[PDB]
């Protein structure tokens, strides 16, 4: 059984989860906004 | 086996000023998304002095919104990751 797919899990790093696709990716698609 | 001083060139002169007919490309470049490059970053034990902020304003406006999420040609991340390597 692999472990990918599931997001990360370490809030002890600072506060929010580490994840791997947030403001970085979530905004790289945002560009899909119609000007 | 030749006059050597044969001053001349190919009679091609084929200019063909075709416009940027970008359709069904076929050059070297895989299709990857955002964090997708995060994997590229790891695949290179090099690393030294790169800027993650430059990739943001470089891959964020080269982004191509598609249902398969955002997709960009590895030729932009390879030129954006190789132009910031001091």
Half-sphere exposure of A26 (CA within 13 A, CB side): 5
Tokens of B7: 């001053």
Pick B65's closest partner by Cβ from A21, A25, A31.
A31
Q: Select the residue from A17, A24, A33 to test the B interface by mutation, using most B Cβ atoms within 10 A.
A: A24
The CATH topology of domain B1-86 is Recoverin; domain 1 (1.10.238)
Cα radius of gyration rounded to whole Å, chain B: 20
Q: How far apart are CA A2 and CA A13, in angstroms?
A: 23
Among the listed residues B27, B31, B74, B28, the one whose alpha carbon sits nearest the alpha carbon of residue B55? B74
């Amino acid at each position: 059984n692999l472990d990918s797919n599931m997001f990360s899990n370490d809030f002890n790093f600072e506060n929010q989860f580490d994840e791997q696709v947030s403001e970085f990716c979530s905004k790289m698609n945002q560009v899909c906004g119609t000007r | 086996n030749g006059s050597s001083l044969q001053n001349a060139d190919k009679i091609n002169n084929g200019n063909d000023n075709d416009n940027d007919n970008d359709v069904v490309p076929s050059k070297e470049g895989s299709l990857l998304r955002c964090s997708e490059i995060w994997d590229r970053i790891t695949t290179h034990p090099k690393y030294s002095d790169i800027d993650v902020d430059g990739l943001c304003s470089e891959l964020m406006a080269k982004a191509k919104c598609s249902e398969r999420g955002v997709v960009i040609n590895a030729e932009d991340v390879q030129l954006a990751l190789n132009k910031h390597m001091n």
